[PDB]
Amino acid sequence: APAGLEVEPFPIQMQVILVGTPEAFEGLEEDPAFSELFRIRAEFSPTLP
Amino acid sequence: LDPAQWRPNLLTSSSSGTPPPIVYEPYATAPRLFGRLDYLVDRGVWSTN
Numbered sequence: 001a002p003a004g005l006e007v008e009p010f011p012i013q014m015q016v017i018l019v020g021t022p023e024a025f026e027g028l029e030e031d032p033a034f035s036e037l038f039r040i041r042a043e044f045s046p047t048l049p
Numbered sequence: 050l051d052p053a054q055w056r057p058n059l060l061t062s063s064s065s066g067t068p069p070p071i072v073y074e075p076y077a078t079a080p081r082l083f084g085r086l087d088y089l090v091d092r093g094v095w096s097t098n
Binding site: 002003 | 087088089090095
């Protein structure tokens with residue numbers, strides 16, 4: 001790109017909801033910023049009664 | 050002689066002293082740390098100033 005628009009930082013109003021397997025997150029839980037950004041852990045039980 | 054190549058570029062104006070000019074840059078990368086040199090392609094040449 002010969003030039004680029006200087007986009008001003010924008011406040012985030014969305015609520016991101018990550019989805020993944022426990023293995024897909026244990027490789028992402030090692031980042032403290034992940035644990036500080038994503039506080040709510042919604043675990044699906046593998047087996048229902 | 051072109052004024053576009055001999056006009057001083059305004060980097061940063063006064064911050065009134067107090068508070069001191071603080072710039073937190075969590076995205077510490079060379080283009081954002083040391084700035085960028087743009088390239089306007091006038092008449093087909095990547096002529097910079």
